[PDB]
């Protein structure tokens, strides 16, 4: 299907040390938020004790609480970039539109921390949230969510949940990375020029993984896991013109065939990253999809 017109315009107007690259990513997120301001939302900052150290979080409190599970949100950025502030535009909207409490997680970035450190942190924070939930007046089963690399983390946390005695009611995967081993058609065909590029993905992996063999570990490549039965209900949102599209959609099909309640939504004409790009109305459409999906959990 054609590229969305606003996406087309955005790609046409696109024009370092690690620190400079991280700063440039943050500046880009700020510019988009200046173009389309987030909704006001009450927040509280805190720090969770994990098995790998303190992890900063920010809890978002909706004006009106309508959803009975906490959400725990893991930002994207290739495992190397991003933070709570870069994803505030998305999380503020998830909070207020769903009417959910959301815990946004500042997990440890690569290459300073390597695989599987953030996976461990993200489990620990989910466990904390499940423990805290009743004192927030909520059910002790959590919803995990994330975009891109953060969607990878949400998927892995979900696969580990039973083994980790972690109660998870649903998983929300926004254009996740899920298979670092296999090339898919979308990975070949949309490899260059659609914001998320082949060269960058290679580099992100070099920063995150310890050795090349880690690509086949299921905590890096959750799509390789042979048994998906009994996993949490899943919303899998993809973008049509995204190298990661096909692995996302294939994982949704696999979940569905494993008896996992699954909703699979491709946003046509879109690119990777669209749910943190509020210049696109499809971002809010996708957040409405989240609210509608979560209405069905209880």
Automatic annotation (TrEMBL):
Provenance organism: Sulfobacillus acidophilus (strain ATCC 700253 / DSM 10332 / NAL)
Matches recorded under PROSITE patterns: LIPASE_GDXG_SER
Keyword presence, Iron: no
Active-site residues, as the UniProt record annotates them: 148
Family per record: Belongs to the 'GDXG' lipolytic enzyme family.
Name of the protein in question: Triacylglycerol lipase
Keyword Hydrolase: yes
Alpha/beta hydrolase fold-3 domain ranges (all copies): 71-275
GO molecular function, one term: triacylglycerol lipase activity
Assigned keywords, A-Z: Hydrolase
Upper taxonomic lineage: Bacteria, Bacillati, Bacillota, Clostridia, Eubacteriales
E.C. number(s) listed in UniProt: 3.1.1.3
